[PDB]
Design an enzyme around this catalytic site. Structure first.
Site, short mmCIF file in Angstrom:
data_model
loop_
_atom_site.label_atom_id
_atom_site.label_comp_id
_atom_site.label_asym_id
_atom_site.label_seq_id
_atom_site.Cartn_x
_atom_site.Cartn_y
_atom_site.Cartn_z
N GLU A 3 4.26 9.63 0.00
CA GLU A 3 5.67 9.50 0.35
C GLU A 3 6.31 8.32 -0.39
N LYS A 25 2.35 4.84 1.34
CA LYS A 25 2.66 5.49 2.61
C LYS A 25 2.20 6.93 2.50
CE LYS A 25 6.12 6.56 6.00
NZ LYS A 25 5.00 7.50 6.31
N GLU A 82 -4.23 6.77 8.77
CA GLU A 82 -3.37 7.94 8.67
C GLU A 82 -4.20 9.11 8.17
OE1 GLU A 82 0.12 6.86 8.96
OE2 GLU A 82 1.18 8.78 8.79
N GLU A 140 0.84 -1.19 0.00
CA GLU A 140 0.00 0.00 0.00
C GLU A 140 0.88 1.25 0.00
N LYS A 161 4.20 -4.98 4.00
CA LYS A 161 3.94 -5.79 5.18
C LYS A 161 3.48 -7.18 4.75
CE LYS A 161 0.49 -2.16 5.64
NZ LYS A 161 -0.35 -1.39 6.60
N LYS A 185 9.41 0.01 5.15
CA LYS A 185 9.15 1.34 4.62
C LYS A 185 10.01 1.57 3.39
N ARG A 232 -0.33 9.90 11.93
CA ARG A 232 -0.89 8.63 12.38
C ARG A 232 -1.94 8.87 13.46
NH1 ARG A 232 2.07 3.64 12.45
NH2 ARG A 232 0.68 1.93 13.07
#
Length: 635
Positions: free
Chosen positions: A451, A299, A352, A297, A456, A473, A304
DNA sequence: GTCCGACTACGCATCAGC
């Protein structure tokens, strides 16, 4: 008998005999202060944990009530994070009390602490009041933080002076360090928790004094003892990760023991939990290294915020640091039922919050998000809209989803929650495994004003047990060659504090506005160099120090550097993004009429010896990089 | 690899001084 010679690092330390206070009596602060000495003395974390564990064993044995203030004093905290207590004690306020403590002029004490990089050593350098109490010192710390309103500062200075007059031996060092938020023991939450888990396992709480068990690691073999304490620590770690609230763990711990702790401190809505942190990966091939099936996905560049929903209907919103942010989002507590289905009666989502423009229908940069108000916002005067991008489901109607994979958690997440174009969306997850389309999805995220890429696992090590491990990340400034590299001029330098005391801790960099033939400050730099490189600077950089600044430099509203330097050193500096600076004059007017440009997340790369100050990055270019940003080129 | 503490920009919230 005499806490002045208290030694918590003694071999074969006995909790009762080697203590320095009577049972049932309050724990003296000198006992806490002498341990901090024995912790800052060494560097092995297993040595600091064992030394602090010796405190807690003696505390749980002699003064169980004093356990909480000892822990918070060790953590340099004032209470649970969702409570929101803050000292409000500035540096200058502290050295104002320091000068009021001893008697030095405020111009003299302020110079010593700057050159030393630590007020604790500066403050340590009448009739004796009663010795200081650990729980009483923690009370004075809380009393200071609650002081608000007009003339509240002078009332804080009084309390700090009231402690500095009652300080004995080394007590003056750690009161000052704690009040400035720089204990610098080399020991923090992870080691405090390991030391607390150790103490309640060797000296079990709730024992009729004298305790029948002062060292429960007696008849154990050293092999089976290390795994015993490691298994005990893991029970405490996970429970605290679901309930990071020492005001809830300690009372349950003190009465039901470590083993029965998870049966009462469970993850439930209304109590914030530690969110799953990410980990920076090198490159796209660096992700394919653990290679298990995963999802990918975006960022999103926001803040957060995890959203809790109690069964009783009340809704709360906590931040990544468990801080209560419900008063910050009245527009979310209102639009709450717009995302849940009838079956949803309790939930917790890891989302987020990113600023969202209603007219253009595009993501706004991070600066627009941090322009919202806090405290108690009224939903009428909200001028910056926000849109949630949910990417995890933790709770669902009485059930906790900690021990479930991302593949299932994403199932109920999409099954029990309805989309809303502009207010609620799911993080665009493209499940794949081929490195061709994987790098394509990454460079796409920038086009959609993001970003980078989140990575994950879906089944293998894909739970939400933050204590065990697990997220990757990946943006743009990590891969070599994909980041904005600026060749900047070192014009200012700042004396470092703590670890960097002595040499410089920061530097002031400048772009070269070729139009005005003058250097313009753009950002500061305090990370990205080795300790040998810092010693390589500072020394070679000291031969160029100058009293007055050169006429062709211009810093505008930037911090005056401690040392002005002859502009000659040119440094390669990598950065994440470029920011519209309300402080820096670099390329002022070239984009916005009044604000310049600064560097977001800058860092040192290498020195450019062949480059001269005139042959550095110009402010003229610098403006083009701000215009070439996709988050900026979307308006 | 973990844990910790150096350090970055930006902007709201707050208060001494005026």
């Amino acid at each position: 008998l005499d806490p002045s010679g208290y030694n918590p690092a003694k071999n074969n330390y006995h909790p009762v005999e080697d203590a320095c206070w009577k049972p049932g009596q309050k724990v003296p602060y000198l006992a806490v202060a002498r341990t901090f000495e024995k912790i800052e003395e060494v560097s092995a974390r297993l040595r600091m944990v064992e030394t602090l564990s010796n405190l807690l064993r003696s505390v749980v044995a002699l003064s169980p009530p004093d356990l909480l203030p000892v822990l918070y004093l060790s953590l340099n905290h004032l209470g649970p994070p969702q409570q929101g207590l803050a000292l409000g004690v500035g540096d200058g306020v502290l050295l104002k009390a320091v000068a009021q403590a001893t008697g030095r002029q405020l111009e003299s004490v302020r110079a010593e602490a700057a050159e030393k990089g630590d007020v604790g050593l500066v403050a340590e350098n009448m009739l004796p009041p009663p010795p200081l109490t650990a729980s009483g010192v923690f009370s004075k710390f809380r009393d200071i933080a609650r002081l608000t309103g007009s003339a509240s500062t002078a009332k804080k200075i009084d309390i700090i002076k009231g402690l500095f007059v009652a300080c004995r031996h080394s007590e003056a060092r750690f009161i000052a360090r704690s009040l400035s938020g720089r204990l610098r023991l080399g020991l923090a939450e992870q080691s405090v928790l390991a030391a607390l888990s150790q103490a309640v396992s060797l000296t079990p709480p709730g024992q009729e004094f004298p305790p029948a068990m002062v060292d429960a690691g007696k008849g154990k073999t050293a092999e089976a003892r290390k795994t015993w304490l490691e298994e005990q620590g893991m029970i405490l770690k996970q429970t605290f990760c679901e309930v990071p609230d020492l005001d809830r763990i300690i009372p349950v711990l003190l009465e039901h023991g470590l083993e029965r702790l998870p049966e009462h401190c469970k993850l439930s809505p209304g109590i914030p939990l530690k969110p799953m942190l990410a980990h920076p990966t090198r490159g796209i091939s660096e992700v394919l290294k653990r290679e298990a099936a995963f999802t990918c996905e975006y960022k999103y560049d926001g803040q957060r915020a995890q959203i809790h929903a109690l069964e009783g209907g009340e809704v709360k919103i906590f931040s990544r640091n468990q801080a209560d942010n419900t008063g910050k989002y009245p527009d979310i507590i209102s639009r709450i039922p717009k995302i849940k289905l009838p079956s949803v009666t309790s939930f917790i989502l890891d989302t987020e919050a990113v600023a969202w423009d209603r007219e253009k229908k595009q993501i706004q940069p991070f600066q627009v998000l941090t322009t919202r108000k806090r405290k108690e916002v009224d939903a009428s005067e909200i001028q910056v809209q926000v849109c949630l991008y949910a990417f995890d489901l933790i709770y669902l109607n009485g059930e906790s989803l900690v021990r479930e994979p991302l593949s299932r958690r994403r199932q109920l997440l999409r099954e029990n929650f309805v989309e809303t174009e502009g207010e609620f969306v799911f993080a665009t997850s493209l499940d794949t495994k081929d490195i061709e389309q994987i790098a394509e999805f990454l460079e796409q995220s920038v086009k959609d004003s993001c970003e980078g890429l989140m990575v994950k696992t879906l089944d293998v090590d894909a739970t939400y047990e933050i204590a065990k491990r697990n997220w990757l990340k990946l943006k743009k400034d990590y891969l070599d060659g994909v980041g904005d590299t600026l060749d900047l001029v070192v014009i200012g330098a700042y004396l470092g504090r703590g670890k960097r005391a002595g040499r410089y801790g920061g530097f002031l960099l400048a772009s070269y506005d070729e139009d005005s033939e003058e250097l313009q400050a753009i950002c500061k730099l305090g990370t990205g160099f080795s300790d040998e490189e810092l010693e390589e600077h500072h020394q070679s950089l000291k031969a160029l120090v100058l009293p007055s600044p050169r006429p062709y430099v211009r810093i505008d509203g930037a911090v005056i550097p401690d040392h002005w330097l002859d502009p000659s050193a040119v440094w390669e500096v990598k950065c994440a993004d470029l920011s519209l600076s309300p402080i820096y004059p670099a390329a002022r007017g070239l984009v916005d009429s009044d604000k310049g440009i600064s560097l977001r997340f800058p860092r040192f790369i290498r020195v450019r010896e062949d480059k001269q100050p005139e042959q550095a990055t110009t402010s003229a270019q610098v403006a083009c990089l701000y215009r070439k940003q996709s988050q900026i080129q979307n308006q």
